[PDB]
Design a protein around this ligand. Structure first.
Ligand SMILES: [Mg+2]
Ligand SMILES: [Mg+2]
Ligand SMILES: [Mg+2]
Ligand SMILES: [Mg+2]
Lengths: 247, 247, 247, 247
């Protein structure tokens, strides 16, 4: 049987890509392709079982309520998710169990692994730094992922000593951005797409985890994994991490 | 209140380093340093709680027997553990269920983390390769660790297609050593010590884990870790990994 | 004034690309676009001053004679260039001075620099190795460039001791392909395009030069540089290196 | 037949290392080791040909005066060379045209090569950045070498547009220190020594030069090189680079 995948924001960048990806997938059939303004009833009309939603922060809450109200599983890449947005989703889910919602900030599997690996490694090293590298058309430095990683690292190293640093003389910015006591350096280079390197060190050894996103469509295999696996965990899951089944 | 640690093979290379390390540790008390011929009863006379044993394969079994018989936890870095010898350690332990033995081939935390990460990432990528790089005085290519690593990766990827590879024409060796369908390349270069890169790739993303050991004594933190935490797992633990408490 | 660029093999992969590149270039005008079977007279009919030729090894010698006979400068990426082919070109050039021919195996500037840098660095280090990384659809291992680099390195280190190597036990292929005493390792990985790393080492330090070709169209800026600069040196030039004006 | 080398500041850190190195060298004869207060005439009494001087800025000028006056070639690693002091060395040399003085701020061959390569590549790439990585006991960020390097690159790229950079929103420091419009990021990490990456990028290709110093004594080969070759360039040479004979 084809799993019946609906895509919201299907003319949006990510949705159109996902529509294509569902087409190509042997196990998935596209049950409905909706973009801004399409009645959500088209989803139930077509017996959608799971929806990919990468719409705007301003419609996703509309979408989710309808999806949960109707027992349609949701793989959500839309951002703007406050704790007040989150609880609302869990509130909606109370009334409909056996409905799985995934909200994840990042669907590139390599990125999710790296962040996971960084989390696991953090407490074992004296030093941790993040170097992030992106194309020079990038507006924010450091990237969200780098900031997300550094904060993860900081939390993992709670109650450890700070990164050792004997710097007493410096040019401004030499030491990167300080995100919760973790230096984050942002390289902007023509030729690059999205890259991130977490470096850990202790006298005697270092450990580096490097993730390279070479395509704009890196998220694809992860969204697909999320779609395939989403029913395995009822209720709300934040982050793609758990669906990777890491043991 | 501080743990009373003893070291067997204390005049051997690793042994002497560990004595120093334990002397140097603020939370650990050296209760015995033995090497060849020193009666093991020195350990019980001095109220030893945990032992580091990096001694020879030919003496380590008798050490273990005594250690287990006496409720002394053992951190065992000495090699030579056949299936039979593992089985024998297990038997001795049956009689002593509160005693903990950790037998591990690698105490470098970064190398242990790196292998765990390789293992957790292996199934998510079309392609996986190991590059190891050592000083040019190394007899064996590839390193034990790299081989162990490729085996782990192969084992983790069972049921996935082999590494895609269109190679039709090659110079012998270009594609490296085949360890379980996983290419391992051994770089031997002046100026290096011990280094390993694990490269995973899929269309649109790569993930790289690099471990660098800059010291021959990079294993000391792991040994001290094993020594501080060994008692948490009654019985035999194989590999340091379970002690790292990876969630 | 527009420099008048003709492209041979204009429906071929490289030619069509070059036609596009000439169009976009403010200083270049396409004077003639010829592909298999177009009479070369179209070139002189359109007052071509310089031709890009990435045709087949079986027509390039036809093309060159005509180009030199007619004082048309030639930027040649076609392969199959024997010393007997080379001399023929210089023979043809005798009769027409103030006609510049460039035959280069590689027009990616980053690749040409790397090879140059490798040449310069080679004699200063005890060890040199090449690691080449490519997409897994690649037929030859190691790549031509890697083999070309290793041979360059070997020549630069003539009368130096061999790479130190104490290996006495190994799996087959662990140490790479041996190209003139330089190990060449070939990684084939999904996600990769064309990458090459030359590693140099001496006790106390290493030096690595890494080139990444992320596009299929990497050669473009170099072919263009060659086109722009080709008249500066009369007669035959083999390799893009000299036109880079390195001091 | 072997060169007679003397070392000034022979009880200083670098001095003593050089004495050992010269003792150890098969082609070099130690003809004098001096430090504080030893009469410079020891050098001429012992038929010294070349001197290594790594002494203090406050004594190096008097050393040089004597060295030059006596036709003794000088390899000068001591720092503190103002424009005036350079000018004064030049004057002394006028009277002694067969005498050679090499004053260099960096004797690590790999670091000198790397800087030369950066310089030769700079003009060919839209984007250039320096990443340096040191042990976490380093007072100054970025390193002198990295700063020197960025300055070199900037200088080499004059007349090309600045690094493309769309950064509009950033945490202070993310983009690193600006040295002449070239970003330099300083990584401080336990387990490291001295490391520098120069990253060049253009649409479709990147080039990376990485130098790793694994030792505090990685400069010894360069100093021995300078000592064996200094006489080839009469007069003052600044930087080791010209001595490397880069063609
Ligand atoms: Mg389908
Ligand atoms: Mg102690
Ligand atoms: Mg044009
Ligand atoms: Mg000597």
């Amino acid at each position: 049987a084809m799993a019946r995948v609906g895509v919201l924001g299907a003319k949006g960048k990510v949705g159109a890509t996902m529509v294509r990806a569902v087409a190509a997938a042997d196990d998935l059939t596209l049950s409905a392709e909706l973009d801004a303004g399409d009645p959500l009833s088209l989803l139930t009309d077509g017996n959608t079982e799971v929806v990919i939603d990468f719409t705007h922060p301003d419609v996703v809450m509309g979408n989710l309520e309808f999806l949960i109200d109707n027992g349609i599983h949701a793989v959500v890449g839309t951002t703007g998710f406050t704790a007040e947005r989150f609880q609302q989703v869990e509130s909606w889910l109370v009334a409909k169990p056996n409905t799985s919602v995934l909200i994840a900030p990042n669907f590139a599997i390599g990125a999710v692994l790296s962040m996971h690996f960084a989390k696991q490694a953090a407490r074992f090293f004296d030093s941790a730094e993040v170097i992030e590298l992106h194309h020079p058309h990038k507006a924010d430095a450091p990237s969200g992922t780098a900031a997300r990683t550094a904060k993860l690292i900081a939390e993992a190293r709670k109650g450890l000593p700070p990164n050792p640093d004997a710097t007493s003389t410096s040019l401004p910015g030499a030491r990167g951005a300080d995100v919760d006591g973790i230096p984050v350096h942002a390289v902007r280079l023509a030729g690059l797409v999205a890259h991130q390197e977490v470096l850990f060190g202790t006298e005697g050894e270092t450990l580096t985890i490097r993730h390279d996103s070479l395509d704009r469509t890196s998220f694809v295999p992860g969204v697909l994994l999320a779609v395939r696996r989403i029913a395995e965990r009822p209720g709300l899951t934040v982050g793609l991490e758990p669906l990777l089944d890491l043991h």
